[PDB]
Every structure is written in C-alpha cells, then in structure tokens.
Amino acid sequence: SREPLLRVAVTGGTHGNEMCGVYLARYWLQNPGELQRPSFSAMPVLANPAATAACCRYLDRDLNRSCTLTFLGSTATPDDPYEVKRARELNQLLGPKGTGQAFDFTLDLHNTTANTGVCLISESNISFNLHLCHYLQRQNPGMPCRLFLYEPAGTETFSVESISKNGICLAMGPQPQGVLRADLFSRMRALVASILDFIELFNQGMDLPAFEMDIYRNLGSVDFPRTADGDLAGTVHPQLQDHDFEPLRPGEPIFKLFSGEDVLYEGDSIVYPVFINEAAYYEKHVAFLKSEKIRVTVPALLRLT
Amino acid sequence: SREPLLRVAVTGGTHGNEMCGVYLARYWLQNPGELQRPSFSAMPVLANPAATAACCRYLDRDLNRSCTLTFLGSTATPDDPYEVKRARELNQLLGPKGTGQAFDFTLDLHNTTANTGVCLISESNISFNLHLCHYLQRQNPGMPCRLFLYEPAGTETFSVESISKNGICLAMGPQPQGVLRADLFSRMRALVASILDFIELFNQGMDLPAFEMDIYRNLGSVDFPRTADGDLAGTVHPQLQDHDFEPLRPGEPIFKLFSGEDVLYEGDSIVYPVFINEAAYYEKHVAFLKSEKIRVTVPALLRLT
Numbered sequence: 001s002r003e004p005l006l007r008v009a010v011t012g013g014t015h016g017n018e019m020c021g022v023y024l025a026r027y028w029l030q031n032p033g034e035l036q037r038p039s040f041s042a043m044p045v046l047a048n049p050a051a052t053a054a055c056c057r058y059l060d061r062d063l064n065r066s067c068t069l070t071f072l073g074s075t076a077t078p079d080d081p082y083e084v085k086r087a088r089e090l091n092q093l094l095g096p097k098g099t100g101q102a103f104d105f106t107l108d109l110h111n112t113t114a115n116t117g118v119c120l121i122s123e124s125n126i127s128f129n130l131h132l133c134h135y136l137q138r139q140n141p142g143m144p145c146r147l148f149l150y151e152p153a154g155t156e157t158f159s160v161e162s163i164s165k166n167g168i169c170l171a172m173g174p175q176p177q178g179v180l181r182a183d184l185f186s187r188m189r190a191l192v193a194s195i196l197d198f199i200e201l202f203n204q205g206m207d208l209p210a211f212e213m214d215i216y217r218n219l220g221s222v223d224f225p226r227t228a229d230g231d232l233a234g235t236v237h238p239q240l241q242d243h244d245f246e247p248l249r250p251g252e253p254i255f256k257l258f259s260g261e262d263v264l265y266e267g268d269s270i271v272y273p274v275f276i277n278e279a280a281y282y283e284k285h286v287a288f289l290k291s292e293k294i295r296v297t298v299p300a301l302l303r304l305t
Numbered sequence: 306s307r308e309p310l311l312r313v314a315v316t317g318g319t320h321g322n323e324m325c326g327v328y329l330a331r332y333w334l335q336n337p338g339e340l341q342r343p344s345f346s347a348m349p350v351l352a353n354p355a356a357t358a359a360c361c362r363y364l365d366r367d368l369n370r371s372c373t374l375t376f377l378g379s380t381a382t383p384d385d386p387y388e389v390k391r392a393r394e395l396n397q398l399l400g401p402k403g404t405g406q407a408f409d410f411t412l413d414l415h416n417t418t419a420n421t422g423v424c425l426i427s428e429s430n431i432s433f434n435l436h437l438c439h440y441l442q443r444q445n446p447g448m449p450c451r452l453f454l455y456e457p458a459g460t461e462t463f464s465v466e467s468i469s470k471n472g473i474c475l476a477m478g479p480q481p482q483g484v485l486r487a488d489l490f491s492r493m494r495a496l497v498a499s500i501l502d503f504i505e506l507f508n509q510g511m512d513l514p515a516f517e518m519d520i521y522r523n524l525g526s527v528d529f530p531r532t533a534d535g536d537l538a539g540t541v542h543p544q545l546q547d548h549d550f551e552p553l554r555p556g557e558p559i560f561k562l563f564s565g566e567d568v569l570y571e572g573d574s575i576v577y578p579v580f581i582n583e584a585a586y587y588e589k590h591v592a593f594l595k596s597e598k599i600r601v602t603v604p605a606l607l608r609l610t
C-alpha cells in the first residue's frame with residue numbers, strides 16, 4: 001500500500017540570485033513553523049550559500065547541473081568547483097542519490113526572467129507529480145499552472161531535486177535576477193503551502209482519481225542568432241518575447257537581428273516556446289526551449305486497490 | 306557666440322550587465338557609420354570591458370562611482386580596484402576631467418530593472434540638457450521622456466559622464482540585468498540617433514526658444530525595511546512596484562514585510578518615486594529615490610544675442 005512522504009525538503013537559492021527561494025529559505029530557517037503539517041515537517045534548505053551571499057547564480061559551476069552520480073561519486077579535491085563540493089553536501093543531507101536513505105521528496109524553488117508565470121518542472125512523468133500539478137490548478141482557478149516535462153537528454157540526471165527519491169521544481173517568472181517582487185514572493189509562498197497541504201492529504205490516505213491533463217514536453221532548444229565568433233547577432237523578436245507557452249507556428253518571427261532583418265521559425269510543426277529570453281541561458285546557448293503540448297492520462301493514486 | 310560640440314562620445318557597458326548599451330557599443334564599434342553626422346562623428350566606447358566580458362555590473366567597484374577627481378588624481382597601485390584603473394583610462398580618453406582637453410559631451414547608456422520607461426539623468430540643470438530632453442519629447446509624442454535631475458550630494462561628481470565638459474545619461478527600463486530585449490534595444494538605438502540629430506542641429510546654429518517643462522529633482526533615498534542585521538525584512542509593496550514617477554502620498558503603502566504587515570510612507574509631502582526596486586541598488590541600501598516634480602523655465606539657446 002501507500003508509503004507516506006515523511007522526509008520532505010524545500011530548497012531555495014539553488015541559484016543564488018533567484019530571490020523568492022533565497023528569501024523564503026532564509027525566512028523559514030528563522031520561522032520553520034510554517035512548514036509543519038500534522039504528518040510531517042518539511043526541512044527548509046538554502047542550497048547554494050556562497051552564491052546566495054554573493055547574489056549570483058553560481059560561483060564556479062551551475063549547482064543545478066552538478067548533481068550527477070559522476071560528480072557526487074568522484075574523489076574530492078581542493079581544486080574542485082565550489083558547487084561540486086556543495087553538491088556532495090546536499091547528497092549527504094538529502095541523499096545519497098539512488099539509495100534508500102534519500103529524502104522522500106524535494107521541492108526546489110526557481111525564478112526566471114522569462115514570462116513563464118507559474119511552472120512546475122518535472123524530470124519524469126511520475127503520476128504523483130502530475131496529481132500535484134492538477135491539485136495546484138484546482139486550488140487556483142484562473143491562474144495558469146503548467147507542467148513542463150523535462151526529461152534529461154544525457155545519461156545522468158543532474159539537478160538538486162534529483163538527489164531525492166522524488167521531487168519537482170516550482171519556477172516562477174518573470175522576475176529580474178537580484179530583484180525580490182512582493183507579488184511573486186507571496187504567490188510562491190502560498191503555492192508552497194498548498195504543495196505541503198497536498199503531501200499531507202496524500203499521507204492521510206486520500207484517493208486521487210485518474211484524470212487527463214495537458215502538459216508540455218521538452219523537444220530541445222533554439223539558440224540566439226550568432227556571428228561566426230558566437231557573439232549575439234540579434235535577440236528574441238518582439239512578437240515572441242514574453243509569450244511563453246503560446247503556440248509558435250512555422251513562418252512566424254522568432255528573432256530580430258541587429259542588422260534589422262527578421263528570422264523566422266523553420267520547424268515543421270507548431271511548438272510551444274518556454275523560457276524565452278532567460279538571462280542565465282545566454283551562456284548555455286538557449287534563447288528558448290521548444291516543447292510539444294500533449295494530453296496525458298494520469299493513473300489514479302488510491303490508498304487501496 | 307555658440308561653440309559646436311565636435312568631440313562627442315557614446316559610452317555603453319558602464320555597467321557590464323546592462324545589455325542595451327553593451328550591445329549598442331559593440332555593434333557601433335563594428336559599424337560606426339550610424340554615429341556620423343555632417344558636423345561631427347560620435348565615438349562609441351565600451352566603458353567597462355572586463356565587467357562586460359563577465360556580464361556583471363562591476364568587478365571591484367561601481368565604475369559609475371569611480372570618477373571623482375580624488376580617484377582620478379590619486380597615485381596608481383597594482384592593488385587599485387579594477388574600475389579605478391579603468392576610470393583613469395576613461396579620464397585619459399575623454400578628459401582629463403575639469404580641463405580644457407575634456408570631450409564636449411558624453412552620452413552614457415543605462416538600463417534599470419525598475420519600471421522607469423525612458424529617463425534622462427542629468428547632474429545639473431544646464432539648459433542644453435533640458436532642451437535635449439524637450440527635443441526628445443517632441444520627437445516622440447505620447448512617449449514619456451522624463452528628466453531626472455540628480456545633483457551630487459557629496460563634494461565631488463563621480464560618474465562616467467562627469468569626465469566630459471558636459472554629458473547626460475539615457476536610462477531605460479524595465480529590463481532584467483543580463484537580458485537584451487528587442488524592444489528596448491531598438492528604442493534606445495532610435496533615441497541615440499535623435500540625440501545625435503539634436504547635436505547636429507545645435508552645431509548648425511539652430512535657435513532653441515525658451516520654454517517651460519516639468520522635471521523631477523532628487524530629494525533622497527528610502528531604504529528597504531531591514532532587520533537589526535540589515536537583512537531584508539520585506540520588499541517594495543505591490544502597490545508601489547512598477548509605479549515610477551507616479552505620485553506617492555503620505556499614508557500610502559510602500560513596503561510589504563515578510564511578517565505580512567504594511568509599511569506606510571510617513572513623509573509630509575507628495576513625492577515622486579524613481580528607480581523603484583532596482584537590483585543594483587539593494588547593496589546601496591536604496592529601495593527607491595524620492596523626487597519632487599517641479600516646473601522649470603529653460604532659457605533660450607540662440608546662435609546670436
């Protein structure tokens with residue numbers, strides 16, 4: 001039968017300049033009462049302390065790309081990237097990744113400079129995660145809450161939340177890095193509260209009926225237009241800017257070059273752009289991710305068969 | 306009679322993560338033709354090369370606070386802040402500050418994460434600068450173009466543009482640091498073109514009739530609410546957020562504390578908040594600047610008496 005989630009973490013500041021999670025984590029470390037439910041208490045964690053102190057995404061390496069078994073399992077060294085060192089600590093705290101000692105669930109908080117609104121990023125189609133999203137949607141009529149299915153292309157998962165048995169990322173934008181907006185802070189805070197409510201209901205044995213829902217599944221990235229030297233030759237087109245999750249159709253403009261020309265989408269199908277013009281993605285060569293919108297059937301989670 | 310402005314510079318990337326100026330400066334260095342007018346050609350300059358390369362505001366010290374006579378005149382040292390070293394180079398290029406060798410005019414380009422729209426920041430009430438703003442307003446009906454008079458409180462001016470005999474800052478927001486928006490890029494680009502048009506007209510001997518206009522004069526800053534340790538205890542209130550240049554009246558809410566309480570403005574007069582929730586200003590302890598809106602009379606600039 002159903003195993004309750006008793007070891008639950010909420011991580012903020014995985015990227016040190018994403019301010020909602022930074023300040024929620026700091027606040028809850030001073031005031032943990034908010035994270036307590038009848039069946040469990042969630043542990044708040046500031047994921048990247050040094051980056052947070054410096055208010056930057058990362059010091060040496062992206063922490064949210066440093067949690068592969070290869071990194072975690074490798075022999076230490078004084079000259080290791082700071083974030084590799086910190087990944088190993090999180091592995092001790094919340095893992096070890098891939099063993100029975102790992103936490104039951106980690107909720108990881110993110111901001112984006114893209115106009116995403118509320119987005120749950122899941123690295124698998126695990127039905128619990130889809131039920132969680134569905135619950136948030138129903139708790140918030142008229143507020144988009146979208147599930148972005150981002151399955152790792154490589155061999156190894158790499159994210160902070162992947163350390164635990166299961167987990168999910170709550171991402172909210174748009175918000176400039178290093179800026180804390182009251183509106184996003186409060187909303188993220190209430191959504192976390194609701195996610196903890198959900199886990200509590202689950203722990204109490206609530207039946208979650210099977211249902212269908214639309215999700216967005218990652219197809220790949222499109223890079224900024226570049227010169228031969230890889231310097232920007234333009235940026236996201238005004239008609240694409242801020243239109244995350246909206247249909248992008250072949251023939252439609254996606255970039256405006258500095259020379260004044262328009263670049264058109266040359267794909268065969270309508271896709272759904274996500275994370276359009278994210279500051280942190282310039283160096284990753286990503287102007288946006290392409291996703292396909294798909295209707296999936298989510299099995300029931302019942303206490304008994 | 307009238308002295309024409311023949312040595313004119315446009316500086317971008319004074320802060321390395323403010324993307325319009327960074328990319329305009331880089332573009333114009335490759336394609337200077339755009340900066341040429343019949344009577345003069347403006348020199349594009351990337352003000353902070355190392356910060357720009359790292360995409361950060363500054364390395365050691367804010368370049369736009371490093372151009373005091375004290376810094377510029379002090380004896381060099383290997384252990385000098387990078388930006389102090391670079392300030393001295395700009396002093397060689399565009400100055401020396403306070404001598405007859407200085408450039409006639411420097412236009413310095415900025416972005417802000419605050420919802421300022423188009424703002425010209427002037428460090429004095431020099432009539433040329435007010436005529437320039439008035440010209441931009443008339444060239445752009447229905448587009449706010451506001452003059453922010455920011456006279457240095459201290460003894461010494463400190464900004465990159467203060468190196469020249471005269472100058473002004475063109476600031477545009479909102480834009481996240483490290484993000485280039487097509488819309489702001491194009492608009493800043495056209496406004497620069499118009500500013501160069503203005504200088505050309507001036508050089509040709511055009512009479513500029515006296516006129517009146519509203520400007521915004523700096524009164525001082527209000528800091529974020531803090532704990533005894535100086536950590537944020539809250540942020541800009543949702544009703545104040547994004548309302549730059551709008552009236553702020555005593556009794557109105559300016560902050561939302563994490564504890565949930567509202568903080569009200571306690572001033573005696575209606576003021577006009579500017580640079581509300583700028584990322585770079587957190588460390589400067591500035592949540593917003595207070596300004597007074599004043600109608601001033603601008604004398605004529607005529608070719609002859």
Ligand SMILES: CC(=O)N[C@@H](Cc1ccc(O)cc1)C(=O)O
Pocket residue numbers: 015064110111112113121123150159169171278280
């Ligand atoms: C803007 C940002 O940091 N986005 C996150 C979103 C994300 C990506 C992959 C994940 O596995 C989880 C979250 C990231 O790139 O790390």
Ligand SMILES: CC(=O)N[C@@H](Cc1ccc(O)cc1)C(=O)O
Pocket residue numbers: 320369415416417418426428455464474476583585
């Ligand atoms: C966001 C930002 O960098 N604003 C500028 C605006 C500014 C301030 C004072 C000046 O003298 C000129 C521009 C700054 O603080 O340097």
Ligand SMILES: [Cl-]
Pocket residue numbers: 131132134135208209
């Ligand atoms: Cl459900």
Ligand SMILES: [Cl-]
Pocket residue numbers: 113114115116241242243244275276277
């Ligand atoms: Cl966007």
Ligand SMILES: [Cl-]
Pocket residue numbers: 436437439440513514
């Ligand atoms: Cl005029």
Ligand SMILES: [Cl-]
Pocket residue numbers: 418419420421546547548549580581582
């Ligand atoms: Cl603002």
Ligand SMILES: [Zn+2]
Pocket residue numbers: 015018109110111
């Ligand atoms: Zn992030």
Ligand SMILES: [Zn+2]
Pocket residue numbers: 320323414415416
């Ligand atoms: Zn600036």
